Amino acid sequence: GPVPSRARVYTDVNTHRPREYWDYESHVVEWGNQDDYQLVRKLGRGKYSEVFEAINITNNEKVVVKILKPVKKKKIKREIKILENLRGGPNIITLADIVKDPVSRTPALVFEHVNNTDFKQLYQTLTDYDIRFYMYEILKALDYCHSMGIMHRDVKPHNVMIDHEHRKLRLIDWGLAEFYHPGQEYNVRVASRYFKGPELLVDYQMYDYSLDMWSLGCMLASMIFRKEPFFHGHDNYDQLVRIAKVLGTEDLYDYIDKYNIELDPRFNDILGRHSRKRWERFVHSENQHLVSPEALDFLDKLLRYDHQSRLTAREAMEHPYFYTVVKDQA
Numbered sequence: 001g002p003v004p005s006r007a008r009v010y011t012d013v014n015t016h017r018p019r020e021y022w023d024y025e026s027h028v029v030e031w032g033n034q035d036d037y038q039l040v041r042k043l044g045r046g047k048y049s050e051v052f053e054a055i056n057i058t059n060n061e062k063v064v065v066k067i068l069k070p071v072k073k074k075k076i077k078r079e080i081k082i083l084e085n086l087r088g089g090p091n092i093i094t095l096a097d098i099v100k101d102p103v104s105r106t107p108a109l110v111f112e113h114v115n116n117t118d119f120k121q122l123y124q125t126l127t128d129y130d131i132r133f134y135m136y137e138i139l140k141a142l143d144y145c146h147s148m149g150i151m152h153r154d155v156k157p158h159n160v161m162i163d164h165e166h167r168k169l170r171l172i173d174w175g176l177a178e179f180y181h182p183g184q185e186y187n188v189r190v191a192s193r194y195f196k197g198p199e200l201l202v203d204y205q206m207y208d209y210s211l212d213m214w215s216l217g218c219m220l221a222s223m224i225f226r227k228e229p230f231f232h233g234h235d236n237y238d239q240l241v242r243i244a245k246v247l248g249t250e251d252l253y254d255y256i257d258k259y260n261i262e263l264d265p266r267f268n269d270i271l272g273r274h275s276r277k278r279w280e281r282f283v284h285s286e287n288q289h290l291v292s293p294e295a296l297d298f299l300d301k302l303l304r305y306d307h308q309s310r311l312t313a314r315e316a317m318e319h320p321y322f323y324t325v326v327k328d329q330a
Ligand SMILES: COc1ccccc1-c1ccc(CNCCC(=O)NCCCCNc2nc3cc(C(=O)O)ccc3c3cnccc23)cc1
Pocket: 043, 044, 051, 064, 066, 093, 111, 112, 113, 114, 115, 116, 119, 122, 130, 131, 132, 134, 135, 138, 157, 158, 159, 160, 161, 162, 172, 173, 174, 219, 223
């Protein structure tokens, strides 16, 4: 069978905690009354949720209500418990309250409101400094939750909210997050297709926090190359082919061998033979102002097949790419 694997940081964080920290299944919820909030307008529909702007009628304060589409009661306790555990973490979204509509009884979570800068105001005047600044901010959130024994598992642009006027960022939607336990085999059918690490794409189930660092590298490539998304696959199978044409086929089969991943017979005759590209081939006149030897080095060390060789979040924060933003913050 498949060679096992261990996270190389924060491996046992959870084992050294009280059961109640990670045994969410047995967490008692106290559901308030959603009438305390008055819906203003719909802001998004998701696969698992529906989000609304609302007003807290006690203090006229602006809030966001997430009405949970029907899942197993476990996955609601999971998300809630993870939000309580992460409360007050740097750049984590804050869970304000937990409520049920009194006539409908469908459960809902209440969050803090973040003012969102238009994407056509962000993309146009993105400096090289702006990409480093917020990348550093996402890594604060990611290194924190990893240090608390949690994986986000759905890191993508949709779930990173940025208030550029206040230069503050927030990692949202924790509905896919899990606790890390050494040896646990996890569900691979998570995250969005473009941001799925190769471990999901091959059904290697013993993954860890480093899954969240593949997604972040996917975002970094998407931004500095002005290509959205960077790995643009038609389906979950072509996604690996899209990846393999950049990272090369050689490191892939060594990855397959090292963990003895039995690979789907669909993959045999579709990947092929592909050299590992040099990143320079992705730069051009209309994107080079964001590209540098430093950013390239940092990018290379996030996108690895072998999840063990990816930088940890705290390794990323110590990379030279961030040296200017580390010193300006002091
Ligand atoms: C400067 O570039 C970067 C540089 C470096 C690294 C990254 C970036 C970068 C790239 C792209 C983007 C995309 N741009 C955000 C996507 C977006 O805007 N997605 C709203 C979809 C529903 C909106 N509605 C709300 N949904 C919520 C759900 C939850 C939850 O489920 O927990 C919690 C809170 C809210 C919430 C809070 N306040 C207002 C609205 C909402 C952001 C940053």
